[PDB]
Write a protein of this length. Structure first.
Length: 13
């Protein structure tokens, strides 16, 4: 998972 806003296009939460 990538829940931080900085994940950007990688956001997956």
């Amino acid at each position: 998972e990538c829940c931080n806003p900085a994940c950007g296009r990688h956001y997956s939460c």
